[PDB]
Amino acid sequence: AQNPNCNIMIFHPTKEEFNDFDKYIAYMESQGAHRAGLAKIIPPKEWKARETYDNISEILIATPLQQVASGRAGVFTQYHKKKKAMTVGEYRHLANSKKYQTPPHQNFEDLERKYWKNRIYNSPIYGADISGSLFDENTKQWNLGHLGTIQDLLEKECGVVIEGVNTPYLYFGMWKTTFAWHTEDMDLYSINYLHLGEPKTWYVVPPEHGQRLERLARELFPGSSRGCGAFLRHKVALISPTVLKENGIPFNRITQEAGEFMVTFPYGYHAGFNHGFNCAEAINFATPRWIDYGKMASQCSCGEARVTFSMDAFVRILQPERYDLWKRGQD
Numbered sequence: 001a002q003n004p005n006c007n008i009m010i011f012h013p014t015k016e017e018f019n020d021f022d023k024y025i026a027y028m029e030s031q032g033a034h035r036a037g038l039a040k041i042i043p044p045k046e047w048k049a050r051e052t053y054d055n056i057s058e059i060l061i062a063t064p065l066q067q068v069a070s071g072r073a074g075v076f077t078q079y080h081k082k083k084k085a086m087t088v089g090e091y092r093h094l095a096n097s098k099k100y101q102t103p104p105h106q107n108f109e110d111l112e113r114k115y116w117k118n119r120i121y122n123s124p125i126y127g128a129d130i131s132g133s134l135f136d137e138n139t140k141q142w143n144l145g146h147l148g149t150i151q152d153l154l155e156k157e158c159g160v161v162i163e164g165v166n167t168p169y170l171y172f173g174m175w176k177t178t179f180a181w182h183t184e185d186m187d188l189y190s191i192n193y194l195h196l197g198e199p200k201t202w203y204v205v206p207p208e209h210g211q212r213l214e215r216l217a218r219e220l221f222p223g224s225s226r227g228c229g230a231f232l233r234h235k236v237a238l239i240s241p242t243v244l245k246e247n248g249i250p251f252n253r254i255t256q257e258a259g260e261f262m263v264t265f266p267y268g269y270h271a272g273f274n275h276g277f278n279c280a281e282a283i284n285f286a287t288p289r290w291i292d293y294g295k296m297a298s299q300c301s302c303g304e305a306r307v308t309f310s311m312d313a314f315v316r317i318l319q320p321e322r323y324d325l326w327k328r329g330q331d
């Protein structure tokens with residue numbers, strides 16, 4: 001078995017190997033990459049996502065989210081308070097203000113310590129889930145706006161034709177902005193490109209150990225657990241590395257820098273934070289190996305997680321028994 005300790009793997013494809021996306025994903029899995037839940041891909045030196053970022057300030061962040069925490073430093077939830085619209089130029093200036101900027105630090109490890117110690121005492125503002133793309137249309141390789149669609153993968157594997165579309169999303173972050181512990185909708189893959197700015201640190205639990213994380217989360221968030229049988233789908237809960245180590249949960253960590261891709265694999269729980277002002281682009285995708293995960297994926301039916309038009313069809317075809325109750329949650 002390849003990668004039996006489930007370590008995060010890092011890949012350095014040549015420009016020749018960067019032509020065929022599906023084939024490279026399948027290569028990475030042949031080496032065991034999926035067992036970690038997360039992989040890093042460093043693009044060939046010849047490749048670029050676009051020529052410059054010099055004209056991005058006029059993108060609108062229509063609903064910036066202020067991430068307010070409750071709990072203790074290592075075990076907290078966050079809620080998203082909606083703020084007034086602002087441009088990317090306005091958001092970048094805010095991120096660089098004395099109130100919100102990255103503190104002085106020695107290295108990534110000192111900054112990680114400061115994040116876990118101090119996150120709960122601040123409320124950083126995140127521009128999340130903004131439909132759009134920063135890839136130039138002439139970028140032919142690993143362009144996240146030109147991938148094969150999940151609807152087309154389901155049709156190719158299963159023969160069924162379904163409604164829905166699959167498009168990327170932009171994320172504009174600042175120091176302390178946080179992504180809670182989650183897997184993807186319908187336990188899909190995701191791919192994330194860090195276009196610009198400061199790094200993003202990731203934590204991940206191997207898929208084969210995801211249920212260990214769920215059991216710990218039911219213990220740490222007991223009221224949430226009684227309210228919903230899949231409450232990590234709400235994307236609100238944070239658990240520190242120290243707490244995960246104290247409770248014996250297997251995990252790994254890695255820092256992504258500008259210019260690098262990350263891939264999350266089906267049922268790979270992940271969480272993390274941004275080090276300063278940055279812009280990432282991400283999209284879900286599928287392969288043949290995903291289909292069985294999609295059939296088994298948990299769902300939120302309490303009604304909090306409230307998800308896309310396209311997830312309807314996935315539930316309807318892969319989880320017909322759940323269909324009914326899940327659409328009661330989404331209506």
Ligand SMILES: O=C(O)CNC(=O)C(=O)O
Pocket residue numbers: 171178179190191192264270280282283
């Ligand atoms: O970058 C972020 O805030 C969160 N992204 C993801 O969870 C991902 O790409 O799967």
Ligand SMILES: [Mg+2]
Pocket residue numbers: 055056057058059
């Ligand atoms: Mg602009």
Ligand code: NI
Pocket residue numbers: 182183184190264270
């Ligand atoms: Ni994710």
Ligand SMILES: [Zn+2]
Pocket residue numbers: 227228229230231233234300301302303304305
């Ligand atoms: Zn729920």
